[PDB]
């Protein structure tokens, strides 16, 4: 009675909101996902069990499910005000998911909810964990991710040794279909860092706060400072994401005329061999807030550790 069919149209926003519950009523949903934790008593990069979330998938004209979810979760009232303030400071960035703060009663009391709109099913941390902890006995997440983004079809896995690199070298072509998604995620990350610096917000960026479309959320561990003096910490993010940048060949679009995958290739003259400025431009475009000096020529390095870092 009410509740489920009233919470549904309260989570339902003002745009189109053709929603369907993910097998729940007014209660939360439990999933098994990967996180990156550091909270003074636990640390690591493992798969924990999420507990406080209600998810509503979205439909469209022909009443078939689509890759869009409304995640409405429950924490603390102080956290309510803190997240509302930070989002109000950060809402104008085009790389931040659209939040919605409301209050709804489950009993005689009134509890607050925070709803995020139009997320994907999996985050970037899920993809990184799936590719860095491969096990052919159970790889359901990787297969689902591959088939939901038109990298292959469901009958591609009926083959045996479909994952091998020596046998079936076509898996490289299959993997190289996520590079554009990764590149757009990198660009949106740079945009988010610029917005955080301009707004005066201090926080650490993790892989599980970004979905596979590039949008950011979860400002629950941030603080506030004077405008223009913000500082993001992006060590673990880039360091963990680095091995995936070459498997998927994310920088293929940089060999075309206007960084567009539909135009012909760039025609460099055969007599050019320096390319010392292009490397700096690429570093400034994709790794702007990585704070450690980068030497395009390793003859200027200070020791072997710097040589490794720049190579």
């Amino acid at each position: 009675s009410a509740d489920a069919q009233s919470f549904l149209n309260r989570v339902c926003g003002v745009s189109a909101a053709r929603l369907t519950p993910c097998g729940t009523g007014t209660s939360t949903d439990v999933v098994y996902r990967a996180f990156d934790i550091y909270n003074d008593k636990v640390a690591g990069f493992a798969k924990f069990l999420k507990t406080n979330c209600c998810r509503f998938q979205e439909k469209d004209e022909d009443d078939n499910l689509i890759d869009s979810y409304f995640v409405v979760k429950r924490h603390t009232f102080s956290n309510y005000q803190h997240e509302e303030t930070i989002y109000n400071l950060l809402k104008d960035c085009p790389a931040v998911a659209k939040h919605d703060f409301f209050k709804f009663r489950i009993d005689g009391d009134m509890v607050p909810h925070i709803s995020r709109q139009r997320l994907t099913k999996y985050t970037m941390a899920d993809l990184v964990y799936a590719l860095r902890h491969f096990d052919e006995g159970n790889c359901d997440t990787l297969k689902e991710i591959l088939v939901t983004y038109n990298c292959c079809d469901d009958d591609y896995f009926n083959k045996k040794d479909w994952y091998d690199f020596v046998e079936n070298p076509d898996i490289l072509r299959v993997y190289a279909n996520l590079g554009e998604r990764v590149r757009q995620a990198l660009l949106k990350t740079v945009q988010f860092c610029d917005a955080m610096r301009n707004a005066g917000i201090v926080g650490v960026l993790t892989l599980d706060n970004q979905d596979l479309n590039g949008n950011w959320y979860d400002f629950g561990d941030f603080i506030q400072t004077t405008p223009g003096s913000g500082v993001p910490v992006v060590d673990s993010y880039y360091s963990l994401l680095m091995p995936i940048l070459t498997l998927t060949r994310a920088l293929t679009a940089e060999s075309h005329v206007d960084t567009d995958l539909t135009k012909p290739y760039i025609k460099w003259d055969l007599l050019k061999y320096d390319f010392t400025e292009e490397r700096l431009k690429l570093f400034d475009r994709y790794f702007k807030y990585w704070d450690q000096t980068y030497h395009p020529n390793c003859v200027n390095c200070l020791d072997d550790r710097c040589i490794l870092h720049c190579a």
Partner: protein, 113 residues
């Protein structure tokens, strides 16, 4: 989470100048950290308005480094005193995580504006 330095740090004391040996007695709330290998300062605060130099004494005394600073930032503080203004500095080359640490601790333990 990925919390920004739960266990905090301790202390702020000593000196500063603008041209090498201009550090006379004490012109800095040189802030934080006594690491496990020795005293290694992180943040500098200045009730003054323009400084490029400082000199923190440590251990041997003979070894006290003439630190190169960076262009400052300014803010006003919500102290019980009332109107109080400093000009913030960090030791040059301080990586992002350390500045985040000191800024978070300063903002979350003591009140600022």
């Amino acid at each position: 989470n990925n919390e920004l330095s739960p266990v905090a740090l301790r202390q702020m004391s000593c000196a500063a100048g603008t041209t090498q040996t201009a550090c006379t007695d004490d012109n800095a709330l040189a802030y934080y950290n006594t690491t496990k290998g020795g005293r290694f300062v992180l943040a500098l605060l200045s009730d003054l308005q323009d400084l490029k130099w400082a000199r923190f004494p440590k251990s041997d005394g003979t070894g006290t480094i003439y630190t190169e600073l960076e262009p400052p930032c300014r803010f006003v503080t919500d102290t019980p005193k009332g109107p109080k203004v400093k000009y913030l500095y960090f030791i040059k080359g301080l990586n992002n995580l350390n500045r985040g640490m000191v800024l978070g601790s300063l903002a979350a333990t003591v009140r600022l504006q």
